[PDB]
Amino acid sequence: IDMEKSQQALVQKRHYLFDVQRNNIAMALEVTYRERLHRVYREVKNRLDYHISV
Amino acid sequence: AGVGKTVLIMELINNVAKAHGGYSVFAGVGERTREGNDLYHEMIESGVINLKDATSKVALVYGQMNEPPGARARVALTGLTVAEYFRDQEGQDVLLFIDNIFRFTQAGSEVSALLGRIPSAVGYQPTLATDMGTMQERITTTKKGSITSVQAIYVPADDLT
Amino acid sequence: VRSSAGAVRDAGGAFGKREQAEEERYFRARAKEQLAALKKHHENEIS
Amino acid sequence: KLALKTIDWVAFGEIIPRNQKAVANSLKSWNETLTSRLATLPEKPPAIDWAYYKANVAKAGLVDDFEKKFNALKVPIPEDKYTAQVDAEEKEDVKSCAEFLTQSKTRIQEYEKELEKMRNIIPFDQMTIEDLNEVFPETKLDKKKYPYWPHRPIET
Amino acid sequence: KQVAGTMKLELAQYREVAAFALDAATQQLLSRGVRLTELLKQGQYSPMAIEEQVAVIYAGVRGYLDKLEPSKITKFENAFLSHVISQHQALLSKIRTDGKISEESDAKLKEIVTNFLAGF
Amino acid sequence: ATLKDITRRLKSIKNIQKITKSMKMVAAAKYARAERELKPARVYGVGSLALYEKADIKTPEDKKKHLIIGVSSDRGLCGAIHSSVAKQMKSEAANLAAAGKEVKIIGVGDKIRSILHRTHSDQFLVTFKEVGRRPPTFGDASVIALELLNSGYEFDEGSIIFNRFRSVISYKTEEKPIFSLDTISSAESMSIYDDIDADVLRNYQEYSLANIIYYSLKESTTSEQSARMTAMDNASKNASEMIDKLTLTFNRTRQAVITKELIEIISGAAAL
Numbered sequence: 001i002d003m004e005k006s007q008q009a010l011v012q013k014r015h016y017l018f019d020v021q022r023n024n025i026a027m028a029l030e031v032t033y034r035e036r037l038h039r040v041y042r043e044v045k046n047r048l049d050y051h052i053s054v
Numbered sequence: 055a056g057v058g059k060t061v062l063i064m065e066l067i068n069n070v071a072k073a074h075g076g077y078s079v080f081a082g083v084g085e086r087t088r089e090g091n092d093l094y095h096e097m098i099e100s101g102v103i104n105l106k107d108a109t110s111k112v113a114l115v116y117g118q119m120n121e122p123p124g125a126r127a128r129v130a131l132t133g134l135t136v137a138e139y140f141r142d143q144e145g146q147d148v149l150l151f152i153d154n155i156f157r158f159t160q161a162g163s164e165v166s167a168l169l170g171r172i173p174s175a176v177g178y179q180p181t182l183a184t185d186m187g188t189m190q191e192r193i194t195t196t197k198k199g200s201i202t203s204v205q206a207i208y209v210p211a212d213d214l215t
Numbered sequence: 216v217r218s219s220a221g222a223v224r225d226a227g228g229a230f231g232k233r234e235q236a237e238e239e240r241y242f243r244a245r246a247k248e249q250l251a252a253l254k255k256h257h258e259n260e261i262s
Numbered sequence: 263k264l265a266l267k268t269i270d271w272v273a274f275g276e277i278i279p280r281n282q283k284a285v286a287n288s289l290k291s292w293n294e295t296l297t298s299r300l301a302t303l304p305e306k307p308p309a310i311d312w313a314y315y316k317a318n319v320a321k322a323g324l325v326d327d328f329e330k331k332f333n334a335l336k337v338p339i340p341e342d343k344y345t346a347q348v349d350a351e352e353k354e355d356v357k358s359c360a361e362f363l364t365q366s367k368t369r370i371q372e373y374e375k376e377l378e379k380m381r382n383i384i385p386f387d388q389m390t391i392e393d394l395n396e397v398f399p400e401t402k403l404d405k406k407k408y409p410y411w412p413h414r415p416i417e418t
Numbered sequence: 419k420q421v422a423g424t425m426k427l428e429l430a431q432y433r434e435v436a437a438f439a440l441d442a443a444t445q446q447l448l449s450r451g452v453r454l455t456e457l458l459k460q461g462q463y464s465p466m467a468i469e470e471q472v473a474v475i476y477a478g479v480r481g482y483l484d485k486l487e488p489s490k491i492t493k494f495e496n497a498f499l500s501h502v503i504s505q506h507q508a509l510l511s512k513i514r515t516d517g518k519i520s521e522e523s524d525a526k527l528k529e530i531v532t533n534f535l536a537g538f
Numbered sequence: 539a540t541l542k543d544i545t546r547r548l549k550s551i552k553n554i555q556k557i558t559k560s561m562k563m564v565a566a567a568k569y570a571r572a573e574r575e576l577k578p579a580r581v582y583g584v585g586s587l588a589l590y591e592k593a594d595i596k597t598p599e600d601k602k603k604h605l606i607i608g609v610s611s612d613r614g615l616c617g618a619i620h621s622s623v624a625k626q627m628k629s630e631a632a633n634l635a636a637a638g639k640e641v642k643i644i645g646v647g648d649k650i651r652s653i654l655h656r657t658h659s660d661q662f663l664v665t666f667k668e669v670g671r672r673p674p675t676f677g678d679a680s681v682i683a684l685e686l687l688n689s690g691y692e693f694d695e696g697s698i699i700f701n702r703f704r705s706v707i708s709y710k711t712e713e714k715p716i717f718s719l720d721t722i723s724s725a726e727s728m729s730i731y732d733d734i735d736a737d738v739l740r741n742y743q744e745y746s747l748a749n750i751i752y753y754s755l756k757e758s759t760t761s762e763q764s765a766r767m768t769a770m771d772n773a774s775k776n777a778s779e780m781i782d783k784l785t786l787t788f789n790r791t792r793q794a795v796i797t798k799e800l801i802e803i804i805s806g807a808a809a810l
């Protein structure tokens with residue numbers, strides 16, 4: 001009986017693996033977006049630094 | 055360096071000098087100025103140096119390692135003179151702490167080559183033993199007084215030879 | 216040139232550290248045993 | 263923008279069947295690397311000093327054009343298509359809340375049934391061999407295989 | 419001052435019995451010494467805030483890492499830093515501002531380390 | 539290095555050489571005594587083994603309980619004495635477990651326990667230390683056999699591994715089988731022996747176990763003392779070569795230091 005009760009207890013919290021997957025996917029998309037922002041910023045500043053160096 | 059010379063000498067000042075009726079003298083020869091200030095403040099705190107009354111029991115002389123060799127080679131003699139006076143005229147027991155008495159020798163060595171003397175065994179002045187003797191021979195317990203002399207002696211590179 | 220007593224630990228090479236450890240481990244063990252005996256004697260002498 | 267639901271890990275590790283730990287550890291590691299990356303990136307892209315800069319360039323028109331194009335043009339953003347795993351969540355509701363819950367609860371029901379049946383029995387000093395035969399079908403002496411007395415294999 | 423003192427004593431004891439490599443007490447002494455040793459390693463041009471150093475050294479010296487392997491201590495150190503710098507910025511700010519591991523701060527540190535160790 | 543580094547190293551190596559020479563002498567004396575005491579024990583143990591090689595006993599091929607005994611000492615510095623024994627023990631244990639057996643191990647001597655405490659750490663039925671401090675006696679073998687029988691691991695087959703002493707410079711590692719009375723009773727060669735129930739035969743097996751353990755102890759101690767003598771001699775020779783090289787280096791460094799100081803003095807004198 002107690003073994004089954006413990007199994008049922010674990011059923012409630014089964015969802016954490018999906019929760020982890022969601023957090024990972026969302027924050028990975030966020031990371032890619034921030035990389036895009038900073039990459040455009042860096043390229044443009046280098047681009048214009050070309051002109052000032054000249 | 056770094057074995058406990060200064061800590062041990064401070065400990066002795068803490069014990070013997072604090073409970074010693076006679077006077078005391080501390081000649082800091084060619085040592086860090088930080089330590090001179092630390093000793094000044096520790097003595098003020100303990101009470102051997104009293105800045106208000108005339109009950110001070112310690113006279114300090116400082117020739118720290120920022121001074122040119124001439125001053126380091128003579129601050130030992132200055133402290134020794136103060137101690138000698140307290141020995142003779144006051145006719146009383148005296149303590150005399152020196153730290154280090156190797157800087158006297160070393161400061162003597164930093165000018166010998168410029169005074170025209172050929173060096174001796176290891177870049178030391180030819181007059182090492184005589185110069186040290188003419189000083190260490192005035193730190194003595196004559197029949198008129200009594201100087202207890204504690205000396206810290208740096209041993210370069212732990213080499214006792 | 217001669218040799219003197221207590222020179223293996225004066226050099227401080229590999230043999231010096233090896234000897235220091237061979238001593239320290241043994242005496243830590245014996246200290247543990249003696250402390251256990253001291254605790255036992257303490258308890259047995261309360262009454 | 264960012265508010266990530268918190269996790270318990272020792273709790274999380276309790277819910278991986280042995281056949282599925284090989285992916286759970288990899289997912290943990292990938293989460294770790296991505297989180298370190300996100301921490302690495304700054305909270306904002308740093309600003310740009312357009313005034314000073316266009317004041318330090320000859321063809322101020324060209325840098326003005328770049329500035330204006332930068333202002334007008336933006337950057338894209340990914341989507342949740344790679345988050346198709348949405349579907350999986352619903353499937354789990356079936357095992358966790360519909361299937362596993364239900365058969366588990368029925369097995370409970372039966373285990374209770376048996377327990378109270380086994381707890382309410384007459385003191386053994388008052389019972390009879392038929393009663394053992396029925397409460398414990400293990401004490402029955404099968405006549406189908408040992409018809410003769412004692413019905414036991416005497417070597418026992 | 420609180421944490422590095424115990425760390426100093428532990429490494430001082432470890433250095434004595436180190437030249438070799440039995441009993442539980444000295445075996446655990448060597449284990450703790452090695453854990454602390456791999457804790458002190460570092461990279462280049464990545465200095466740590468003092469509170470972060472305190473967190474790492476506290477985790478290492480309070481017998482927590484004694485379970486882990488010594489080749490994985492760098493992984494721990496790094497991941498623990500990354501986790502704390504974001505989730506528990508408040509605790510680090512508390513330690514910096516108050517400049518000591520108060521009892522409540524110690525209890526927090528305790529629970530954070532206990533949770534993180536298992537979750538890794 | 540500098541002159542003081544070389545001086546300290548040279549002094550340390552000289553002390554080490556002195557110590558190894560003294561230990562070689564001690565080991566040689568103990569070896570002479572061990573050989574003297576080994577001759578009679580050699581005849582005694584060979585006699586005690588007489589029966590099994592005269593009435594050829596084949597171990598049953600249907601039993602899973604096996605015992606491995608490995609005889610060594612606590613002392614180190616004996617070269618490849620403990621190493622060979624432990625290597626052969628793990629070889630035999632691996633073979634037995636690959637054949638589907640249930641092996642245990644008895645370690646007579648710390649070094650055996652240590653070498654096998656990483657793998658085979660759980661098969662130790664019991665191990666014995668304090669070996670090698672004094673020459674082994676029949677009391678030691680009686681105690682080992684008594685603690686083997688008392689500890690209720692009724693084994694079905696046995697083996698003992700020891701370093702048989704061949705010559706002052708050489709030794710061999712042996713494996714002498716040990717049988718349990720279950721194998722002696724059911725052996726047809728044993729049908730000839732008269733006045734033999736299963737109780738006198740049990741006392742006989744217990745005594746023969748003590749006998750074989752004692753034989754192995756004597757052989758092992760003789761070989762170990764020989765190996766320690768050889769190892770100390772080689773270590774002293776190596777220390778002597780190192781002392782020669784370091785003395786040459788020290789002389790070079792001393793002369794160089796004299797020249798350097800003198801040139802400094804000369805340059806100072808001529809630079810006035």
Ligand SMILES: Nc1ncnc2c1ncn2[C@@H]1O[C@H](COP(=O)(O)OP(=O)(O)O)[C@@H](O)[C@H]1O
Pocket residue numbers: 055056057058059060061062
């Ligand atoms: N009694 C002592 N107890 C503990 N540490 C000491 C003691 N004396 C000296 N030390 C150590 O030595 C250092 C101070 O050495 P010090 O005596 O000032 O140098 P020196 O003797 O070369 O002038 C301190 O940092 C301390 O760690």
Ligand SMILES: [Mg+2]
Pocket residue numbers: 059060085
């Ligand atoms: Mg000093």
